[PDB]
Amino acid sequence: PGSMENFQKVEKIGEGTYGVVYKARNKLTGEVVALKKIRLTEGVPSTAIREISLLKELNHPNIVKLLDVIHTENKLYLVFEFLHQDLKKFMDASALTGIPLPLIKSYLFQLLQGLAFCHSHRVLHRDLKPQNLLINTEGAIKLADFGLARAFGVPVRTYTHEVVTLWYRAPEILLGCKYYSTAVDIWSLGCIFAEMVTRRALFPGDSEIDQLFRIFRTLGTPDEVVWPGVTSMPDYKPSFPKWARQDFSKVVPPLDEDGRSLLSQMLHYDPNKRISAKAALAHPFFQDVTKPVPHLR
Amino acid sequence: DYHEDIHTYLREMEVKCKPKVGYMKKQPDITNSMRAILVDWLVEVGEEYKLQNETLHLAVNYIDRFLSSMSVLRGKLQLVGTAAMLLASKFEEIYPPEVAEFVYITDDTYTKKQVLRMEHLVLKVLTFDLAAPTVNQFLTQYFLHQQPANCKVESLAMFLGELSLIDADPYLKYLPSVIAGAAFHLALYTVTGQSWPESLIRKTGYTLESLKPCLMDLHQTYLKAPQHAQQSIREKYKNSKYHGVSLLNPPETLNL
Numbered sequence: 001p002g003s004m005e006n007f008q009k010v011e012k013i014g015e016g017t018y019g020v021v022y023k024a025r026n027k028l029t030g031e032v033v034a035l036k037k038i039r040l041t042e043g044v045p046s047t048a049i050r051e052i053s054l055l056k057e058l059n060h061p062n063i064v065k066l067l068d069v070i071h072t073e074n075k076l077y078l079v080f081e082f083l084h085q086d087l088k089k090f091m092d093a094s095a096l097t098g099i100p101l102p103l104i105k106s107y108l109f110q111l112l113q114g115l116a117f118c119h120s121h122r123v124l125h126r127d128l129k130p131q132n133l134l135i136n137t138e139g140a141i142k143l144a145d146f147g148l149a150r151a152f153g154v155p156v157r158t159y160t161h162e163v164v165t166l167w168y169r170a171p172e173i174l175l176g177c178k179y180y181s182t183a184v185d186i187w188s189l190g191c192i193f194a195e196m197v198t199r200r201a202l203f204p205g206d207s208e209i210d211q212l213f214r215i216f217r218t219l220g221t222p223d224e225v226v227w228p229g230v231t232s233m234p235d236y237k238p239s240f241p242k243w244a245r246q247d248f249s250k251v252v253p254p255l256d257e258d259g260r261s262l263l264s265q266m267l268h269y270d271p272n273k274r275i276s277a278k279a280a281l282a283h284p285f286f287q288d289v290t291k292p293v294p295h296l297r
Numbered sequence: 298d299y300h301e302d303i304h305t306y307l308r309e310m311e312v313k314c315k316p317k318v319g320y321m322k323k324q325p326d327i328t329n330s331m332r333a334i335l336v337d338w339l340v341e342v343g344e345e346y347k348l349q350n351e352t353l354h355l356a357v358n359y360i361d362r363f364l365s366s367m368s369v370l371r372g373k374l375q376l377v378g379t380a381a382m383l384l385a386s387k388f389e390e391i392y393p394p395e396v397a398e399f400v401y402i403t404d405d406t407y408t409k410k411q412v413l414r415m416e417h418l419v420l421k422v423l424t425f426d427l428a429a430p431t432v433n434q435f436l437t438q439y440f441l442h443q444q445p446a447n448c449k450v451e452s453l454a455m456f457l458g459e460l461s462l463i464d465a466d467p468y469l470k471y472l473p474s475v476i477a478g479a480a481f482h483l484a485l486y487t488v489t490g491q492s493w494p495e496s497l498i499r500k501t502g503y504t505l506e507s508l509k510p511c512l513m514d515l516h517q518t519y520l521k522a523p524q525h526a527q528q529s530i531r532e533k534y535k536n537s538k539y540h541g542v543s544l545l546n547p548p549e550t551l552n553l
């Protein structure tokens with residue numbers, strides 16, 4: 001329904017998977033929006049094609065809303081609801097206070113809702129990281145940047161291997177499994193849960209092998225007991241050091257029993273055993289969940 | 298694994314993504330046979346670039362939806378098909394062919410500029426709604442109900458589902474889930490003598506009775522396949538990748 005005429009550009013926000021995002025305001029309704037600009041080579045980029053097609057299907061309070069697509073022959077503008085901040089910046093701003101537990105619990109609950117919705121509509125996000133999780137002043141958190149997303153099938157076939165920002169990338173991708181599915185997004189959220197509690201990334205590797213070894217030193221080097229089939233995985237090597245699994249209470253020390261239980265299920269090695277977003281919603285961790293406003297801004 | 302949620306969602310979306318059954322009658326310059334020639338060519342393109350079967354099914358969905366609202370002259374039908382295949386590839390493939398490859402495969406019938414402009418037009422007309430359920434997406438779920446898994450059944454069902462793409466009359470009137478139901482039963486029956494399983498009645502609500510109309514059409518298509526003006530699917534399914542299923546003899550009768 002839109003035109004570029006009724007939008008006033010305010011400022012650049014950033015660059016995600018593709019294009020550039022600006023804060024803007026609809027002059028007529030007053031609505032503040034985020035505008036994702038795409039310069040149009042190979043035609044319309046696959047990332048745009050996927051992001052638009054899938055976001056039009058994904059209407060949910062914890063998924064960023066795509067409002068309009070404004071199409072010139074040289075320019076493609078995606079009009080999105082505007083959110084106030086990203087989770088990484090919020091965690092940075094919480095350096096000295098910490099993030100109140102009710103807010104961590106609320107954010108995780110909402111992320112899982114948003115994710116369960118994607119997965120129930122056959123969509124993998126594949127780039128869950130704090131930079132892509134956006135918050136507003138009313139306490140909402142929402143999944144954003146669906147540039148790396150894809151529609152999957154039941155059961156899955158082989159998809160793109162080069163997926164998920166390294167620090168948040170699941171062990172099954174790192175080990176070259178032919179098949180990955182919804183469990184990859186849960187892995188990322190589990191890393192993010194830990195990060196909200198400690199305010200530091202759980203597994204900050206700088207190569208794929210470093211990433212794997214950091215995971216192994218925390219969760220133990222996986223064997224055929226914990227993860228049937230690990231040793232036959234494409235990029236498994238018998239030479240991997242065999243680290244003992246640590247006491248989970250030491251992985252994220254402020255977490256209490258319920259929190260630890262949930263995190264351990266989100267970081268289970270075997271994707272089959274790893275908890276679904278749908279199942280995680282009913283975890284006892286969330287028994288007293290509310291939706292308070294952020295304690296800052 | 299969200300299997301039920303996803304199936305339910307696809308059943309909603311296939312109704313929304315369905316082309317207009319009667320569109321060809323309302324096209325001044327193109328016919329079912331011209332469409333058959335196009336889709337058969339796309340099968341060849343898919344083979345040439347080793348594209349997914351899903352990609353083929355998506356492109357045909359885009360074409361039929363496009364032609365449901367847009368009048369197209371015969372000399373431009375291939376351009377529509379080409380842009381549809383480029384979009385399907387970008388959506389579905391890990392490594393889609395480059396635009397130049399798509400230009401090349403028309404044997405310079407059209408320019409890159411024309412293909413790219415058509416891409417934009419197709420996106421406009423479909424309002425970017427590209428995540429359409431296919432016969433393939435339903436078949437793949439139905440395969441999970443085999444006891445036990447049979448490779449010939451899987452490939453043969455895929456083959457039969459693909460044949461339906463060629464002939465707008467009659468297959469435009471059936472939903473992807475129903476064509477898939479008919480293809481799976483026909484395949485299972487051809488290979489093993491077994492029938493549409495009870496577990497799939499529970500999943501889909503479809504019975505042999507509700508599948509019968511589609512089944513009778515598909516059976517006839519199957520029996521007549523060797524004589525069809527379009528042969529690219531039969532040739533493709535001779536390959537070991539699809540366990541040579543097109544060489545299997547169709548059952549003479551179904552006894553429904």
Ligand SMILES: NS(=O)(=O)c1cccc(Nc2nc(OCC3CCCCC3)c3nc[nH]c3n2)c1
Pocket residue numbers: 013014015016017021023034064080081082083084085086131132134144145
């Ligand atoms: N404090 S701030 O500068 O105003 C501010 C800061 C961070 C994010 C926002 N709002 C915002 N950002 C998006 O993408 C930002 C983009 C995300 C991926 C990584 C690069 C940046 C959106 N996409 C839809 N709605 C969006 N809203 C506002």
Ligand SMILES: [Mg+2]
Pocket residue numbers: 321322323324325326327328
């Ligand atoms: Mg006509």
